Amino acid sequence: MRILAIDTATEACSVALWNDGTVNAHFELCPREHTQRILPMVQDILTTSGTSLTDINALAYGRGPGSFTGVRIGIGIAQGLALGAELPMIGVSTLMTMAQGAWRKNGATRVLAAIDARMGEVYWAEYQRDENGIWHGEETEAVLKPEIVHERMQQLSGEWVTVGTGWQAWPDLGKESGLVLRDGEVLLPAAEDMLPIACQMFAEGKTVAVEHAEPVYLRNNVAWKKLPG
Amino acid sequence: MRVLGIETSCDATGIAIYDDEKGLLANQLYSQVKLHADYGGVVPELASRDHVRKTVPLIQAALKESGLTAKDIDAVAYTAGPGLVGALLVGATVGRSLAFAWDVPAIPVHHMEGHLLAPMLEDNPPEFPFVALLVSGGHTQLISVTGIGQYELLGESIDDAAGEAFDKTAKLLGLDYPGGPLLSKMAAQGTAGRFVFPRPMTDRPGLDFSFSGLKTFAANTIRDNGTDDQTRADIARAFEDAVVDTLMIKCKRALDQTGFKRLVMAGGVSANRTLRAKLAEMMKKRRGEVFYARPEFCTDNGAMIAYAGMVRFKAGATADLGVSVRPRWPLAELPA
Numbered sequence: 001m002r003i004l005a006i007d008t009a010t011e012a013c014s015v016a017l018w019n020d021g022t023v024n025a026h027f028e029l030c031p032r033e034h035t036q037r038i039l040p041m042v043q044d045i046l047t048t049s050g051t052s053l054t055d056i057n058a059l060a061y062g063r064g065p066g067s068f069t070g071v072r073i074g075i076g077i078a079q080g081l082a083l084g085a086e087l088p089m090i091g092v093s094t095l096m097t098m099a100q101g102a103w104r105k106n107g108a109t110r111v112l113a114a115i116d117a118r119m120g121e122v123y124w125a126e127y128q129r130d131e132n133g134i135w136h137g138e139e140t141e142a143v144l145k146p147e148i149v150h151e152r153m154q155q156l157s158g159e160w161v162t163v164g165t166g167w168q169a170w171p172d173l174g175k176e177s178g179l180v181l182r183d184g185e186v187l188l189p190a191a192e193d194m195l196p197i198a199c200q201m202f203a204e205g206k207t208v209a210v211e212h213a214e215p216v217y218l219r220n221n222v223a224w225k226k227l228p229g
Numbered sequence: 230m231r232v233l234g235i236e237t238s239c240d241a242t243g244i245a246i247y248d249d250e251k252g253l254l255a256n257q258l259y260s261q262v263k264l265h266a267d268y269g270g271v272v273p274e275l276a277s278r279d280h281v282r283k284t285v286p287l288i289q290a291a292l293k294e295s296g297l298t299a300k301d302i303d304a305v306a307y308t309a310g311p312g313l314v315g316a317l318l319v320g321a322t323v324g325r326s327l328a329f330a331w332d333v334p335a336i337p338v339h340h341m342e343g344h345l346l347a348p349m350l351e352d353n354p355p356e357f358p359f360v361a362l363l364v365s366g367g368h369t370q371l372i373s374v375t376g377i378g379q380y381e382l383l384g385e386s387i388d389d390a391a392g393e394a395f396d397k398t399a400k401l402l403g404l405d406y407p408g409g410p411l412l413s414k415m416a417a418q419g420t421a422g423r424f425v426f427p428r429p430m431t432d433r434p435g436l437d438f439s440f441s442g443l444k445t446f447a448a449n450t451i452r453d454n455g456t457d458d459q460t461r462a463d464i465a466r467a468f469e470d471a472v473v474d475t476l477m478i479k480c481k482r483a484l485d486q487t488g489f490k491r492l493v494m495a496g497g498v499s500a501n502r503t504l505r506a507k508l509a510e511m512m513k514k515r516r517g518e519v520f521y522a523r524p525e526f527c528t529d530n531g532a533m534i535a536y537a538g539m540v541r542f543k544a545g546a547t548a549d550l551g552v553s554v555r556p557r558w559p560l561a562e563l564p565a
């Protein structure tokens with residue numbers, strides 16, 4: 001099967017194509033450019049692959065968390081394409097994506113993903129790869145203050161790899177945690193790392209119609225104070 | 230042809246299909262009014278989020294309503310601004326990519342051109358040239374319109390626009406946000422002349438507007454007067470009459486200056502029943518004509534975007550693969 005993946009949840013833009021195991025991937029940094037790069041990149045990767053949008057069997061999209069605005073660019077662009085080309089959709093976590101990247105880059109199987117959520121907080125996840133290549137820990141995703149991440153790491157043991165801008169903003173995040181922390185060499189999610197997750201989800205029938213695609217923001221307390229009463 | 234039109238500039242999700250032969254084939258609308266009512270304004274992040282929940286289903290329901298399929302659509306139009314960056318981005322990304330996937334041209338639409346043209350959707354659309362009154366939440370302009378994209382700014386507000394003025398005095402009166410439609414209804418049970426508010430910037434010549442002095446004048450009156458429903462209604466009518474008369478006087482002067490015999494009224498405040506009667510009466514006495522949209526097309530709606538999209542497509546304004554929004558987008562900048 002063919003899978004198209006796009007992601008714009010962070011400062012990067014990436015698109016990747018999977019063609020019954022053969023991979024086409026593009027990645028760059030897009031600060032303040034996502035909407036001017038994303039569709040040209042989908043077009044590049046289709047054409048240079050000699051594949052049309054109608055060839056694709058599923059559209060995978062970075063579902064969050066990350067920049068609210070980036071997260072919505074990703075989902076909106078993906079919904080249009082899927083709506084337009086009648087494609088099923090697969091939402092992939094950006095934290096889980098960066099964990100897959102770590103697995104890809106140096107065989108990491110225990111990943112602490114942290115994204116800079118701003119407002120003093122980080123988006124947090126503990127992912128661990130099982131023997132079959134499935135990542136466990138989706139229930140651990142949260143937006144957290146550095147002190148509560150500290151409390152989380154105290155419940156953990158052993159050696160972990162670190163990925164995401166979170167650790168770049170808070171390099172002493174795991175100080176006095178009791179863990180052995182190794183850099184995972186993954187700062188940002190890459191659509192290429194969505195593909196294998198997308199594949200497994202596709203196999204087990206975890207694809208949704210365009211209208212079911214939902215972001216994951218994690219930070220939901222976003223409104224100013226209600227009026228008296 | 231047929232154009233699918235997408236409106237998400239602020240707090241309402243709008244999707245329509247316009248046919249230049251058959252007319253309006255689909256109109257869909259979800260208003261986020263009760264989402265923001267507890268905050269006393271539109272919370273941007275909560276607006277951006279609900280557009281993501283509504284855009285696609287409303288698009289599906291518009292094609293479903295119309296019995297149309299993708300091949301029946303020749304272009305996709307979407308509001309690119311002005312508005313909330315966050316809101317406009319939902320409609321524009323879905324739109325731009327939907328047009329890419331359908332392989333049809335994409336058409337970025339100016340929201341105020343949308344309001345301006347909404348009257349073209351009724352029987353007997355205005356012919357060029359005309360004077361246009363754009364009165365919305367954030368905008369209150371007089372424009373000399375000689376054709377598509379030939380919009381010359383005759384006048385504008387130097388402070389509060391009429392809509393916000395309605396919303397701010399409505400709030401003082403203890404009404405839900407946005408209260409402008411609710412103040413108008415309250416004012417219907419008011420005694421004319423009981424209170425007398427000023428008609429701002431009508432003692433000198435000129436076509437600019439100022440409404441911030443009316444909030445203070447209203448507030449001060451509510452403070453030195455009774456709390457009985459009647460006196461509240463009396464202030465509401467004093468406020469309406471003042472605004473309506475101010476706009477009327479300004480419209481007269483702009484028709485006098487330009488020599489035009491047609492007056493186009495647009496924007497949310499153009500739904501105002503008192504202003505409609507008044508403008509309609511003035512154009513009778515001038516042996517001319519007033520034009521406005523049905524009330525539902527005065528406030529935010531997809532239909533006006535499917536129409537102005539149709540118009541701008543015919544005028545060559547297609548977009549490249551880039552997507553860009555303009556939260557501040559001057560009408561004066563739209564080319565011909």
Ligand SMILES: Nc1ncnc2c1ncn2[C@@H]1O[C@H](COP(=O)(O)OP(=O)(O)OP(=O)(O)O)[C@@H](O)[C@H]1O
Nearest residue numbers: 365366367368392409410413496497498500501529
């Ligand atoms: N019947 C009415 N009487 C008075 N004001 C009204 C009425 N109906 C709607 N409005 C006003 O219309 C406004 C909403 O319309 P519109 O969407 O044109 O404005 P907006 O989106 O705030 O303006 P802009 O497009 O400049 O941002 C609100 O201020 C509302 O109070």
Ligand SMILES: [Fe+3]
Nearest residue numbers: 340365528529
């Ligand atoms: Fe508007």
